[PDB]
Amino acid sequence: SALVGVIVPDLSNEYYSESLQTIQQDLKAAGYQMLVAEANSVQAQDVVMESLISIQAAGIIHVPVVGSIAEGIPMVQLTRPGFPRVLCDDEAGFFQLTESVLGGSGMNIAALVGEESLSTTQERMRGISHAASIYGAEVTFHFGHYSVESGEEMAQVVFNNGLPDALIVASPRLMAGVMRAFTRLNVRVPHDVVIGGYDDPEWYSFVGAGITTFVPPHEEMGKEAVRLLVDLIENPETGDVVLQGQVILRGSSTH
Amino acid sequence: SALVGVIVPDLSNEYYSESLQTIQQDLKAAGYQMLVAEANSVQAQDVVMESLISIQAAGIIHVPVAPEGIPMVQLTRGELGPGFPRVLCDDEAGFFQLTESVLGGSGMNIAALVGEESLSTTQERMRGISHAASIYGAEVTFHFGHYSVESGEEMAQVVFNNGLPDALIVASPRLMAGVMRAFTRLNVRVPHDVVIGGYDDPEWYSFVGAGITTFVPPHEEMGKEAVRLLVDLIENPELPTGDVVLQGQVILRGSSTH
């Protein structure tokens, strides 16, 4: 087959769709056609995997789910030993992001993050905690899902308990929820709270004086995932590549 | 054999990706696996289609721009014939209702930001806007472009430079993102300076410009209907299935009232 399957947790999520365009272009140039599947659970991923094995696909680029084991098929893991991975430096990125919202000591930060057990969450937490420690700030982590509903819920909790000086939000979907709740509660950004976010959907540029954000290198990650998979197909038997994103400074993080 | 191909023109467009979750769930309930591909040209569509013949797919759901043997449902456009059912949205109705909700009085100015004029969907959208304007005696200036943020930025500058109308109508969330970036840079207040009506419903519509009043196409309904029509074709190819025209809804928020 000149066929490569790409498995993502969620097609509607803007985070995963950004890389797909650059993945497809680079797969086409290599002589491969891209088919995308969506799998958020073990059974869904198991069914997708055996579908791609039955087609006899040339390779698989995927975002793995906990509890799943894939065999005899070149495979590159995205975002998170037997297979090469392409990762983002989330620790360093959330370190810098947290530093950008902090100006002084004796300050409070609330960090809205995902499921605690994910290695990605652990990396982000380590960055946030380190920046908060060195600046003499204290962080409270709230664990949710990457969804607008979770975002709205956690932002309402944060408001009711007395707003912190700073908010770190580890997802654009959580960020949309935060902004929905803050508009409803007349919370002014950056007047009442400074905010740091993740990724860069277009709307970041035109709310909260511009959302200061850590942006992972989506295009580079896709190129590198294709580059590594093509190398795995041609040269049968390599490790992880960790790429640096950038913090874009805007109005939300300062007074 | 348990695999259904879904072909969209652009995966990163929220118009096409919003029905995908529904399509997947409903295919799964019918015992089918979804595989998505992207094809925006005739050459890309052909390669994608012959790939699905090689897989021997049970069915195809696609936005066309089409080989036989495999059951297919068409979304938003395509050939009208027996064995080729189409799920369609009523764009004329939506944009008529959207324009109405934005107009408050008579003789007012409306600017409308739309796609390529040649497109059959754009034609239907203009109809709704022009007819709504007629009833309210309003005049409409049609600005054409592409469904992209840059186009929406460019066009909104021109609109601001030539004097702001009473009302603005925007036919894409990507264009609306362009308009709001331009309006932020040019210090334009919504709905105080201009009133605005938009298209579809990304989450950010709810928290900018006092909430963007919008016409939302029925994404979930389109997804449910397309799987239903495909299962109809797979199980009973002798039974007919025509076009389904679906109606969306206008959500009223703060951007369209002074």
Torsion of CA B222, B225, B227, B231, to 10 degrees: -160
Residue of chain B minimizing CA distance to A183: B207
Is B37 in contact with A34 (Cβ distance < 8 A)? yes
Instruction: Tell me if chain B has a CB within 8 Å of the CB of A206.
Output: yes
Instruction: Tell me if chain A has a CB within 8 Å of the CB of B36.
Output: yes
Per the structure, the complete domain to which residue A173 belongs is given by 90-215+246-255
Q: How close A28 comes to chain B (CA, Å)?
A: 10
Are A45 and A115 members of one domain? no
Residue B204: list chain A partners with CB under 8 A: 176, 179, 201, 203, 207
Are B241 and B256 members of one domain? no
Are B255 and B129 members of one domain? yes
Are B58 and B132 members of one domain? no
Whichever domain contains B65, its CATH number is 3.40.50.2300
- Provide the chain B residues 102-121 that lie in CB contact (below 8 A) with chain A: none
Are B42 and B164 members of one domain? no
Put the strands of the sheet holding B249-251 in their side by side order.
B139-144, B109-114, B167-170, B195-199, B213-216, B249-251
Q: What is the DSSP letter of A9?
A: S
Please state how this structure was obtained: X-ray
**Backbone phi, then psi, for A28, in 5-degree steps?**
-65, -45
Q: How close B12 comes to chain A (CA, Å)?
A: 5
C-alpha distances (whole Å) from B102 to each of A83, A204, A238, B16, B34 are 55, 26, 59, 26, 40
Pick from A67, A19, A51, A2: nearest CA to B27: A51
Q: How close A206 comes to chain B (CA, Å)?
A: 6
How many CB atoms within 10 Å of residue A80?
Answer: 14
Show the tokens assigned to B18. Answer: 């919003």
C-alpha distances (whole Å) from A250 to each of A174, B72, B101 are 19, 48, 35
A66 with A46: CB under 8 angstroms? no
Residue of chain A minimizing CA distance to B149: A202
Q: For chain B, after which residues does the C atom lie more than 2.5 Å from the next written residue's N, i.e. where is it broken?
A: 65
* Distance separating alpha carbons of residues B179 and A172, to the nearest angstrom: 20
Residue of chain B minimizing CA distance to A185: B207
Are B151 and B197 members of one domain? yes
Sort A222 into a burial class: Cβ within 10 Å, 0-12 / 13-18 / 19+: buried
Are B239 and B136 members of one domain? no
- 3-class DSSP state of A95: helix
Is A205 in contact with B181 (Cβ distance < 8 A)? yes
C-alpha distances (whole Å) from B28 to each of A8, A63, A220, B48 are 17, 20, 33, 22
Q: What is the DSSP letter of A249?
A: P
- The count of domains in chain A is 2
* Distance separating alpha carbons of residues B160 and B180, to the nearest angstrom: 12
Phi-psi region of A250 (alpha: psi -120 to 50; beta: other; left: phi over 0): beta
Are A62 and A98 members of one domain? no
Are A103 and A210 members of one domain? yes
Is A206 in contact with B180 (Cβ distance < 8 A)? yes
Sort A217 into a burial class: Cβ within 10 Å, 0-12 / 13-18 / 19+: middle
Are B76 and B111 members of one domain? no
* Distance separating alpha carbons of residues A141 and A118, to the nearest angstrom: 14
Are B159 and B78 members of one domain? no
**What are the E-state strand segments in chain A?**
3-8, 33-38, 59-62, 75-78, 85-88, 108-113, 138-143, 166-169, 194-198, 212-215, 241-243, 246-248
Q: What is the experimental resolution, given in Å to one decimal place? A: 2.3
> CA quadruple A134, A139, A141, A146: dihedral positive or negative?
negative
* Distance separating alpha carbons of residues A65 and A54, to the nearest angstrom: 21
* Distance separating alpha carbons of residues B59 and A202, to the nearest angstrom: 35
Is A20 in contact with B11 (Cβ distance < 8 A)? yes
Instruction: Tell me if chain B has a CB within 8 Å of the CB of A173.
Output: yes
B93 with B147: CB under 8 angstroms? no
Instruction: Tell me if chain A has a CB within 8 Å of the CB of B38.
Output: yes
Are B225 and B236 members of one domain? yes
Of B34, B54, B149, the CB nearest to A202: B149
Residue of chain B minimizing CA distance to A16: B12
A162: number of CA atoms within 13 Å, CB side? 1
Contacts of A237 (CB under 8 A, 6+ apart): none
A20, A36, A185, A211: best to mutate for the B interface, most B CBs within 10 A: A36
B170 with B145: CB under 8 angstroms? no
